[PDB]
């Protein structure tokens, strides 16, 4: 399946992924420690005054002076005196009131007539208290300052370690993704090179290139999604809930309600947004298609005045686009960020309710630090929810692209083999009962059989032009082992390796594709062995076909366009040059139908007079000069054989030569 193969490629480079996850985990732990440090700083130091105090002799440094009386805190005690003037510093509104006497029990504190009255339910009890001045409160807050430049230092110290590891994990997840995609692109291209011509002849080049390049970018986005959005946030959320359960289990089990919420919202968003975004993408493609059809066919519209109806169709598509886009806007409004803000405010509600209930009875004294920690953690929790949800909605297109690639990778009937080039063939080609049905139903070749001689085999002609011709170029090597047999020098074509067949053949297409790079690179194709020999053959090329342009005075001219950058004739010159460079042992030239028959073709004719010096130069003799200058001629009757003879065809069937003279 799709996910199985993605896991297969990801288990490769497992060291980088495991390193990334570990660095991530450390960074997450470090980053999430900070709010727990804030909890410590709140509940211990800033709320330590709320904790009980004792009176002891001023021997320890922890003890703090209060109007000449030294009071030491319970948590900070060394057990010198128990129940020795127990004291409470309760808070009445914005005024911390000192209660020297041992407070019996907490409650709703109120200050009346310079006396503190504490009420708990029905019962109430009063004590004497004195309002503290700013200085006194600060002095009592002094036995914490010393311990607050460790908590702060820890927060600072665990925030500059997390940062480096966070950089590390993001880089490693990236590196792992791009390396996996590198391996995937290399594997796909190697499998392309093994695959047959039939796959290319079915669909255009665009689908192939999309599978190699564009779909692999989609898979890169998938891997970065899964790793940086799902896995990262998953580990983050796990650590967050770990901390929340270490803080308050009862409230954390409320906070876990967000996970079913995310499940529900991401499921609904998928279910609807897949439909809406599919329709938007389809309609946008339809709109761009309408614009391209219009611009290409504007003159025809103007001629017949179809512009009003065309604009009506365009506005129909555009208004449907606007409808679906507005519906998706409604969904995203109700269910992307506004919902996050809702969840955030409701979380604050749950906090206020729970901690208010704590502020009732006597469980709300040390808990406000937990409130701060929850408030800090939940913002970290609700941030990536939108990213998770949107990427979950977007995963389906990436799974589609990945499946389209793994269809290509999992294809069978590959042409894998070696390339023996041990000896040069003589070129005694022959055929016996050769019948090849490319369309399985339709027979394209009907028992063709002819014996080419040892060189000077120039016998090829289409069925009066544009009939059953070019497929014979495909007959030898691209399609094989259907029926009949074909031999070269007394040995079978099918038994030999296909690269061994191609090791000595050389073909000029009807549309020679000029490769990128230099003209020397376009000819030699950057062959490693043929570096200096490319220049040695370039001497022969300039001697035979001189550089009339000669823009850089060498072979450094970069090829700019795919074909006919300089002239249509130069394309053929480069093609014949590439043919003569590799091997003149066997070669099949183009049909030259597309060419205009300018004077430059005469130079190509001279190149033919060079190129026919080689061994067994097949030529689809469409041109009159190619017909007359042929050593032998073989016109085919729809894959069958009319006859053989340069003059015998002229004698018997005068209409063929006359028709080719009329056409050419």
């Amino acid at each position: 399946k799709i996910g199985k193969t993605l896991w297969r490629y990801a288990l490769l480079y497992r060291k980088l992924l495991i390193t990334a996850v570990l660095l991530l985990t450390v960074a997450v732990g470090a980053e999430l420690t900070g709010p727990f440090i804030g909890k410590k700083m709140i509940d211990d130091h800033i709320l330590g005054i709320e904790k009980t105090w004792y009176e002891a002799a001023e021997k320890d440094k922890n003890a703090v002076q209060f109007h000449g009386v030294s009071y030491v805190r319970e948590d900070r005690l060394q057990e010198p005196v128990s129940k020795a003037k127990e004291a409470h510093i309760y808070q009445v509104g914005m005024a911390f009131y000192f209660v020297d006497q041992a407070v019996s029990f907490d409650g709703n504190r109120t200050v009346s007539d310079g006396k503190l009255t504490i009420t708990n339910g029905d019962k109430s009890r009063a004590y004497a208290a004195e309002k503290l001045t700013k200085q006194e409160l600060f002095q009592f807050y002094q036995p914490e300052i010393k311990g607050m430049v460790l908590l702060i230092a820890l927060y600072g110290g665990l925030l500059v370690f997390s940062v480096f590891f966070q950089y590390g994990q993001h880089y490693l997840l990236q590196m792992s993704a791009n390396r996996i995609i590198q391996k995937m692109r290399q594997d796909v291209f190697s499998h392309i090179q093994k695959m047959p011509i039939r796959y290319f002849d079915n669909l255009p080049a665009g689908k192939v290139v999309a599978r190699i390049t564009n779909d692999t970018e989609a898979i890169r986005d998938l891997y970065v999604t899964v790793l940086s959005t799902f896995v990262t946030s998953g580990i983050y959320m796990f650590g967050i809930f770990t901390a929340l359960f270490l803080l308050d289990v009862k409230l954390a089990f409320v906070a876990l309600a967000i996970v079913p919420i995310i499940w529900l919202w991401s499921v609904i968003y998928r279910r609807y947004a897949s439909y809406y975004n599919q329709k938007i993408r389809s309609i946008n493609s339809d709109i761009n298609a309408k614009m391209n059809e219009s611009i290409q066919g504007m003159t025809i519209i103007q001629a017949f005045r179809h512009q009003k109806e065309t604009m009506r169709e365009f506005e129909e598509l555009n208004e449907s686009h606007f409808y679906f886009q507005n519906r998706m806007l409604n969904l995203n409004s109700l269910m992307s960020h506004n919902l996050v803000n809702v969840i955030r405010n409701l979380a604050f509600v749950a906090l206020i309710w729970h901690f208010g209930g704590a502020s009732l009875n006597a469980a709300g004294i040390v808990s406000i630090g937990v409130l701060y920690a929850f408030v800090d953690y939940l913002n970290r929790l609700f941030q990536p929810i939108t990213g998770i949800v949107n990427q979950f909605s977007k995963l389906e297109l990436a799974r589609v692209s990945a499946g389209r690639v793994f269809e290509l990778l999992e294809e069978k009937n590959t042409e894998e083999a070696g390339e023996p080039a041990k000896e040069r063939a003589l070129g005694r080609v022959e055929f016996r009962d050769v019948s090849f049905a490319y369309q399985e139903g339709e027979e394209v070749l009907k028992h063709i059989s002819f014996t080419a001689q040892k060189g000077e085999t120039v016998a090829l002609v289409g069925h009066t032009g544009s009939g059953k011709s070019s497929i014979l170029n495909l007959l030898f090597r691209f399609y094989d082992a259907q029926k009949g047999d074909v031999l070269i020098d007394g040995k079978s074509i099918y038994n030999m390796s296909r690269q061994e067949l191609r090791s000595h053949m050389g073909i000029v297409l009807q549309d020679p594709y000029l490769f990128s790079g230099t003209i020397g690179s376009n000819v030699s194709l950057d062959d490693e062995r043929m570096t200096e020999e490319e220049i040695k053959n370039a001497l022969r090329q300039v001697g035979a076909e001189p550089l009339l342009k000669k823009l850089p005075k060498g072979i450094n001219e970069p090829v700019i366009e795919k074909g006919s950058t300089l002239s249509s004739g130069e394309r053929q010159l480069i093609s014949f040059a590439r043919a003569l460079a590799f091997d003149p042992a066997i070669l099949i030239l183009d049909q030259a139908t597309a060419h205009i028959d300018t004077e430059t073709e005469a130079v190509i004719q001279k190149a033919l007079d060079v190129v026919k010096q080689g061994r067994t130069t097949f030529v689809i003799a469409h041109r009159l000069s190619t017909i007359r200058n042929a050593d032998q001629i073989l016109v085919l009757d729809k894959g069958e054989i009319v006859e053989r003879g340069n003059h015998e065809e002229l004698m018997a069937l005068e209409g063929q030569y006359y028709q080719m003279y009329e056409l050419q």
């Binding site: 925030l159 290319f200 606007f322 906090l351 194709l525 009329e662």
Partner: protein, 573 residues
């Protein structure tokens, strides 16, 4: 900010939507300041002894009310703004298409199809992004940021506020810097990926050559491996992308830590409470998004200004030279005078001048012969009034060509171009393209006159069969016949055929020409074929060479004097 001055027509037309949206947006940006301060007040009340369940119910109810208000108002401003954005995209698609429809070949000769189709996709999306998300980031960067700042200052503390906010502008400028560098390196890697795509397309298209000369597992594998190692230099992008999150985390964590520490020092000095400190950490979480939004607004408005300039360069900076300002004419009896007319396209500075002197009358079939590239199509292109008018004059039965109503004029001409282009529709709809009224029996007679109907009922799955966009059962002659049938279904006063007959041999096409000339019954017809068979039946024939009339007259005078006519008549057969 400049682009918002340019789109004043859009905001003036839709002032109500944007006014309502900005009102709700400022209202909810004010209302978001209340939940954290209420939480802080609740903490301070809990710490205080006066806490009661009535306070709990009050804070809970107020939170629910503010929550629902923020959700509802959020939905409505999102709907209004982003509906305005999608609506601007609709309007600009409509404007661009209405411009392209009312624009002649010259504009396409200058501006390639790729650029115009790019304007319809990227530039409109950028402009719509500015009217939507751009306005939003302008609001959230200025008003939300300053509201957060002023609330943190007044309602909590000014010392804390100015201490804690010091790293956030550093975050803002760092985000702008990293965003710029990511854009540069992503452009570089995208260029590398484009190179990879070009090389793979070259290998795929030239796969026969890569197989023929044995470079299957030798050279193209090395090229794809090396270029994939170059596309692996998106690690240079990752080095900058991976500083985006940790820089933010570092600065924000420092801001939280400043807030915590200084708040814990101010609570010691009795300048703050715990709840105000907690509310500060909440507002610090609110404040992060604006500091991103500043950089995103800069990028968005710059890209939108560029896109709007690019759109208006076509829309506002182009106008067709075609203005029937005062039509006072009626359907003319084919006495069309070209006594002198001369012009060029912009492809030369009046050097390769086409320079013609001719006249025709109703029923005068005007065959036009010549070699390739020799002006034959150019004269009818001038008759079609696609380009601005040449020197001299073309006159229709007394009135010049320029004064004729353009719609009526272009409706007189039933024109079959050399490129039989189909619209990727059904054959019936392609034929009714000419006569866009409701279908009747005339379409069957019209396609029967084309002579392709005998093949159309059987071979291409009947009439209702998709053709175009690679269609089904394609053929150039069949497309030519469908084009001729389209022209016939238009029922033109003036028929023009440019090389449509050349696809099929002269044996059927000559009979088709004869049947057309029989059916028209004296309507004007122009024939432009490289062959001379159809031309032979023309009552008037002319031969052009180099954009100049070599000879003109009947077929007999050409066969006597013009050697090119007899020689080409003999060469084809």
């Amino acid at each position: 900010f400049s682009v918002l001055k340019k789109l004043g027509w859009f905001f003036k037309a839709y002032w109500l939507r944007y006014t309502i949206a900005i009102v709700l947006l400022l209202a909810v940006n004010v209302i978001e300041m209340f939940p954290p301060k209420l939480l802080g007040n609740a903490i301070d009340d809990m710490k205080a002894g006066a806490f009661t369940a009535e306070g709990l119910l009050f804070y809970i109810g107020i939170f629910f009310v503010l929550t629902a208000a923020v959700y509802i108002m959020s939905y409505f401003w999102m709907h209004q703004l982003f509906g305005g954005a999608n609506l601007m995209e609709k309007i600009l698609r409509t404007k661009l298409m209405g411009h392209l429809l009312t624009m002649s070949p010259p504009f396409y000769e200058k501006n390639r199809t790729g650029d115009l189709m790019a304007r319809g996709t990227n530039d409109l999306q950028a402009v719509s992004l500015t009217t939507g998300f751009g306005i939003l980031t302008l609001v959230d960067s200025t008003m939300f940021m300053m509201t957060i700042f002023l609330t943190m200052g007044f309602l909590i503390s000014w010392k804390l506020t100015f201490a804690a906010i010091i790293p956030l502008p550093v975050m803002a400028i760092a985000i702008s810097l990293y965003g710029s560098k990511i854009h540069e390196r992503f452009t570089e890697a995208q260029n590398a990926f484009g190179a990879l795509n070009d090389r793979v397309l070259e290998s795929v298209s030239g796969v026969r050559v890569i197989r023929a000369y044995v470079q299957e597992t030798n050279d193209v594998r090395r090229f794809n491996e090396m270029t994939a190692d170059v596309y692996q230099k998106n690690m240079k992008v990752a080095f900058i992308d991976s500083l985006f999150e940790p820089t933010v985390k570092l600065l924000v964590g420092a801001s939280y830590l400043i807030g915590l520490g200084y708040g814990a020092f101010l609570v010691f000095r009795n300048e703050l409470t715990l709840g105000e400190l907690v509310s500060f950490n909440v507002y610090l979480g609110m404040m992060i998004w604006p500091m991103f939004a500043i950089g995103e607004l800069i990028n968005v408005m710059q890209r939108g200004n560029a896109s709007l300039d690019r759109v208006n360069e076509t829309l506002s900076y182009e106008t067709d030279v075609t203005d029937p300002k005062q039509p006072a004419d009626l359907k003319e009896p084919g006495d069309i005078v070209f006594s002198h007319v001369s012009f060029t396209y912009p492809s030369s500075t009046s050097d390769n001048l086409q320079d013609i002197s001719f006249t025709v009358r109703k029923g005068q079939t005007v065959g036009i012969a010549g070699k390739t590239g020799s002006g034959k199509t150019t004269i009818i292109k001038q008759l079609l009034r696609q380009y601005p008018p040449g020197e001299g004059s073309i006159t229709f039965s007394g009135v010049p060509i320029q004064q004729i109503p353009l719609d009526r004029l272009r409706g007189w001409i039933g024109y079959v171009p050399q490129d039989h282009l189909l619209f990727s529709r059904t054959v019936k709809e392609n034929i009714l393209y000419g006569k866009q009224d409701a279908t009747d029996k005339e379409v069957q007679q019209a396609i029967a006159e084309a002579h392709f109907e005998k093949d159309l009922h059987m071979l291409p799955s009947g009439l209702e069969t998709m053709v175009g966009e690679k269609g089904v059962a394609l053929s150039g002659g069949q497309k030519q016949r469908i084009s001729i049938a389209r022209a016939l279904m238009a029922n033109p006063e003036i028929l023009i055929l440019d090389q449509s007959l050349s696809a099929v041999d002269a044996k059927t096409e000559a009979a088709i020409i004869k049947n057309i000339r029989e059916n028209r019954k004296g309507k004007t017809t122009f024939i432009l074929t490289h062959r001379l068979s159809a031309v032979e039946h023309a009552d008037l024939i002319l031969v052009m060479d180099g954009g100049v009339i070599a000879e003109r007259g009947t077929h007999q005078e050409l066969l006597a004097n013009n050697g090119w006519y007899r020689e080409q008549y003999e060469r084809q057969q």
